[PDB]
Amino acid sequence: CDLPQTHSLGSRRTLMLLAQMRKISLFSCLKDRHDFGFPQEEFGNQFQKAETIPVLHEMIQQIFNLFSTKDSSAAWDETLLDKFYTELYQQLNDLEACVIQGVGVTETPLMKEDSILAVRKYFQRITLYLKEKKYSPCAWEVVRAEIMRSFSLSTNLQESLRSKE
Numbered sequence: 085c086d087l088p089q090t091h092s093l094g095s096r097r098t099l100m101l102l103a104q105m106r107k108i109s110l111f112s113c114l115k116d117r118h119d120f121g122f123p124q125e126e127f128g129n130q131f132q133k134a135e136t137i138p139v140l141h142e143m144i145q146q147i148f149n150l151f152s153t154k155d156s157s158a159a160w161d162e163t164l165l166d167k168f169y170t171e172l173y174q175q176l177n178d179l180e181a182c183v184i185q186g187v188g189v190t191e192t193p194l195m196k197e198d199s200i201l202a203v204r205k206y207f208q209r210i211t212l213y214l215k216e217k218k219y220s221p222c223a224w225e226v227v228r229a230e231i232m233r234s235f236s237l238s239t240n241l242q243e244s245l246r247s248k249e
């Protein structure tokens with residue numbers, strides 16, 4: 085079930101919310117924003133459904149882990165954080181169990197190497213980065229910014245999700 089469920093309506097909703105949930109100064113770290121350079125060239129592959137289970141799940145996953153801690157709620161509004169991370173929790177759980185299960189279609193570890201690799205590198209460098217900075221007020225900011233950019237990009241592969249007339 086690797087369909088544009090949260091990419092159609094969740095795109096704007098998540099975008100706006102996630103945008104108002106992050107309160108910081110863009111000038112707080114101009115020498116940190118640049119990071120997590122995800123190779124959209126090789127990672128750009130949303131034409132496959134059973135192949136998006138890894139990339140998709142991985143994305144919402146890394147977010148759940150980070151939002152699964154108190155550090156996240158301690159960095160930004162708790163209310164927004166709760167409802168936010170909450171939606172993703174049930175999202176990944178359902179979405180994943182949707183494609184993951186044999187009810188639909190599965191993927192092979194052959195192509196999953198790249199997908200899993202890219203996604204892994206992103207989340208890895210993300211958590212690792214902020215982890216080295218001691219979850220400082222600057223790290224969280226950088227991670228967030230990239231999260232939005234990468235998110236929008238990953239979702240903007242075909243640009244045919246849902247005609248927003």
Ligand SMILES: *[C@H]1O[C@H](CO)[C@H](O)[C@H](O)[C@H]1NC(C)=O
Pocket residue numbers: 188189190191192
């Ligand atoms: C998807 O992966 C599973 C892994 O066990 C099976 O190999 C399955 O054969 C693959 N694709 C389908 C649904 O035929």
